[PDB]
Amino acid sequence: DWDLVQTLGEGAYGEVQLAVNRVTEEAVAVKIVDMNIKKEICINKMLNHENVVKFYGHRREGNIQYLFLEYCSGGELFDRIEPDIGMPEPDAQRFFHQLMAGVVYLHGIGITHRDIKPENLLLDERDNLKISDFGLATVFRYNNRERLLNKMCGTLPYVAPELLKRREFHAEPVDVWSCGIVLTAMLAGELPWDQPSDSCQEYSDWKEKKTYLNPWKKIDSAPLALLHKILVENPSARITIPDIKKDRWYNKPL
Numbered sequence: 001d002w003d004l005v006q007t008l009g010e011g012a013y014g015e016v017q018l019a020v021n022r023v024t025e026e027a028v029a030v031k032i033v034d035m036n037i038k039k040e041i042c043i044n045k046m047l048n049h050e051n052v053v054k055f056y057g058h059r060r061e062g063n064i065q066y067l068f069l070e071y072c073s074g075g076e077l078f079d080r081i082e083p084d085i086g087m088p089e090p091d092a093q094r095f096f097h098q099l100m101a102g103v104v105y106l107h108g109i110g111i112t113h114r115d116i117k118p119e120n121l122l123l124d125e126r127d128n129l130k131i132s133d134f135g136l137a138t139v140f141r142y143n144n145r146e147r148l149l150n151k152m153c154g155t156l157p158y159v160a161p162e163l164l165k166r167r168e169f170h171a172e173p174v175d176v177w178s179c180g181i182v183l184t185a186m187l188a189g190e191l192p193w194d195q196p197s198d199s200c201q202e203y204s205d206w207k208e209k210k211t212y213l214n215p216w217k218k219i220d221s222a223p224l225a226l227l228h229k230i231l232v233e234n235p236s237a238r239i240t241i242p243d244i245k246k247d248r249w250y251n252k253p254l
């Protein structure tokens with residue numbers, strides 16, 4: 001059926017192989033996991049959008065799952081972020097538009113990803129950004145009724161502060177915050193804090209508006225002003241995606 005040509009990634013999660021069709025030479029990605037995966041499959045089956053990694057199907061051979069996925073030859077966004085520099089501002093803006101499109105799509109169908117970070121955003125052959133790895137994703141809305149979440153999911157530098165502080169919390173502002181951290185990384189090549197908490201010096205400095213320090217001094221006033229609306233501790237005063245779409249920098253031709 002498919003020839004496994006090479007490893008695209010490996011981790012405790014499992015591995016990702018580039019597979020090439022024996023007859024047609026079509027290339028796809030195959031995520032292989034040795035048995036959570038049932039849910040990842042379930043969620044993947046719900047998705048159809050240009051800014052999400054497309055799911056083609058799956059096959060279970062014993063205890064091993066093979067998920068057939070759209071091959072994104074551009075790799076992880078993470079490898080486009082030059083350490084302590086980031087990337088040109090216009091590329092950052094374009095990737096952010098595309099990230100927003102994907103997140104808007106997921107939220108529209110009541111799905112929250114919960115693990116948004118540059119390692120889980122892939123780039124296709126035309127450098128279009130695609131949301132990847134739905135292994136922590138879940139439903140937060142059923143028939144116009146929202147459920148608040150309580151699970152400790154994600155990676156600390158990207159997680160919203162309410163995740164640590166509150167007994168439960170709305171899904172959407174958590175994904176928005178992580179998108180702001182990804183935006184900061186893209187602009188400055190630097191994560192702003194290890195943990196979103198007052199005991200982290202870099203976090204308090206941000207709340208004390210010390211943007212003369214890194215990474216904020218590397219960032220132009222315009223996108224910086226977007227980041228002040230996104231990286232807001234109180235999730236109820238945090239900017240929503242409909243209002244992100246109205247931000248001056250977001251709409252600035254670059």
Ligand SMILES: NC(=O)Nc1cc(-c2cccc(F)c2)sc1C(=O)N[C@H]1CCCNC1
Pocket residue numbers: 008009011013016029053069070071072073074075076119120121122132133
């Ligand atoms: N779908 C697809 O092409 N996948 C895909 C393709 C990748 C890739 C593409 C080109 C060059 C290269 F070195 C890697 S990496 C990757 C992937 O899904 N990695 C995961 C591992 C777990 C952490 N999140 C990213």
